[PDB]
A paper describes a structure:
All these viruses utilize TfR1 as their cell entry receptor, and the ability to utilize human-TfR1 (hTfR1) distinguishes them from non-pathogenic viral species. As a potential broadly reactive immunotherapy against NW pathogenic mammarenaviruses, we designed a TfR1 mimetic that blocks the GP1 receptor-binding sites. Thus, we based our apical-domain design on wwTfR1 instead of on hTfR1 to achieve high-affinity targeting of pathogenic arenaviruses. We introduced several modifications to the wwTfR1-apical domain to allow it to be produced as a stand-alone protein. These modifications included the elimination of a long loop (residues 301–326) from the apical domain and the mutation of several hydrophobic residues at the interface between the apical- and protease-like domains to increase hydrophilicity.
Author numbering:
A (entry chain A): 195 to 209, 211 to 297, 330 to 378
B (entry chain B): 87 to 241
Write the structure that this text describes.
Amino acid sequence: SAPNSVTITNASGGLYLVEYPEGYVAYSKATEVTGKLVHANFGTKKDFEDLDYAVNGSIVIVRAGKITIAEKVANAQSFNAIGVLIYKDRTKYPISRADEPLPSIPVQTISREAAEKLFQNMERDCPRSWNTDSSCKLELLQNRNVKLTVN
Amino acid sequence: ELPSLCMLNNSFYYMRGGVNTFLIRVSDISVLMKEYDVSIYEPEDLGNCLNKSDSSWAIHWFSNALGHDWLMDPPMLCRNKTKKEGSNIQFNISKADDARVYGKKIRNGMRHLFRGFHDPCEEGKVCYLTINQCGDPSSFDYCGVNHLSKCQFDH
Ligand SMILES: *[C@@H]1O[C@H](CO)[C@@H](O[C@@H]2O[C@H](CO)[C@@H](O[C@@H]3O[C@H](CO[C@H]4O[C@H](CO)[C@@H](O)[C@H](O)[C@@H]4O)[C@@H](O)[C@H](O[C@H]4O[C@H](CO)[C@@H](O)[C@H](O)[C@@H]4O)[C@@H]3O)[C@H](O)[C@H]2NC(C)=O)[C@H](O)[C@H]1NC(C)=O
Ligand SMILES: *[C@@H]1O[C@H](CO)[C@@H](O)[C@H](O)[C@H]1NC(C)=O
Ligand SMILES: *[C@@H]1O[C@H](CO)[C@@H](O)[C@H](O)[C@H]1NC(C)=O
Ligand SMILES: *[C@@H]1O[C@H](CO)[C@@H](O)[C@H](O)[C@H]1NC(C)=O
C-alpha cells in the first residue's frame, strides 16, 4: 500500500523524492528498480536503434504517441531496459497499429511536471527532429540514478 | 528557545526547533521548479511549505541565520502542503551565473551555523540547499535512530 514513487539519487549524497505518481501502473511484482535514466523518444524500434548511448541496465523515459504503450515496453525490454517511465507530451500524437506480437519490467506513467523535474537534472538537448519541448534531455549523467518503486 | 543544530557528516545536517526536526542537505540536485512550485516572497509564505503552519517559525529563523534577505534576494522554492510528497525548501546557492554572490552568502551562513561545514558545491555547476521536515515522505528515513543517534545536538 506504500505509494509508487520516482526519486533521484546522486553519488551517495542522498535520495530526493521527485513524485508520487497517481497514474496508471503495471506490476509484474512489487518492484524497486534503480539505474541511469535515458530518453528513448517514442520508444519505437527505430527510436531505440537510433540512440547513441547504452540502454541496458537503465530506465528509459518515453513519450506517449506513435505506438501503443505495450509495444514501447516490449521494445525497452527487447533492449534490456530495467524499467519504463511514460510522460505525455504537449502535442498528442495518434497511435497507428502495425504488425505486433504478444509486462515484466516496471511501467510508471508520470506527469509532465515530474518529467521536466527529471530533465532539469539531465544533460544533452533532445534532437530538434523530435519536435518536443526544449526542457527535454537525453541522459542522466554525473553518476546520478533514478529509483522507481512500484507497489 | 532557539533551535539546536548538528551535522552528522558532510552530507546530512539537522536542525531541531521545538518539537520538530528538519533535515538540511547541500547537493547538486533540484526537484522543484518555479513553474510548478511555491515561491516564498515574504516570511508569511513559509506557512505554505510545512505540514503544520506554526513550525514554519523554525524555517524563518534559519533563513535569517543564513543571511537571506527577504527584500532583495531570490525567493526560495518549496513544495505545497496539498502535495503528498512531503515538504521541500530549496535555496539556489549555485556557484554560477546570477546566484553566485547570493550562494556565497548562504554558504557563509552555513559556516557560522555548522562548525566544520563542508562545501560540496562545484564551481560553474548547479548547487542547492534543501530542507525536509522529518516525518514527511520527502525526508525518508534520514531522521531515524541510525542517523540522529550518533549526532549530538547543541545551541
Ligand atoms: C539555480 O541557479 C543556477 C545559476 O543561476 C541556474 O542555472 C542556470 O540557469 C540559467 C537560467 O536558466 C541558465 O542561463 C542560460 O545560459 C545559457 C548558456 O548555457 C550555458 O549553460 C548551459 C547549462 O545548461 C550549458 O549547457 C552551456 O554550454 C552554457 O555553458 C544561455 O544560452 C541563456 O541565454 C538566454 O538569456 C539571454 C539574455 O541573457 C536571452 O536573450 C537569450 O535569448 C537566451 O534565451 C541563459 O543565460 C544557465 O545555463 C544555468 N547555468 C547552469 C550552470 O546550469 C539554475 O537553473 C537554477 N535552478 C533553478 C531550479 O532555478
Ligand atoms: C551494457 O553492456 C556492456 C557490454 O559490453 C557492459 O559492459 C555494461 O556494463 C552494460 N551496462 C549496464 C548498465 O549494465
Ligand atoms: C554519512 O553518514 C551515513 C550514515 O549516517 C553514511 O551512510 C554515509 O556514507 C556518510 N557519508 C559521508 C560522506 O560521510
Ligand atoms: C496549494 O494547492 C491548492 C490546491 O491544490 C491551491 O489552492 C493553493 O493555492 C496552493 N498553494 C499555493 C501557495 O499556491
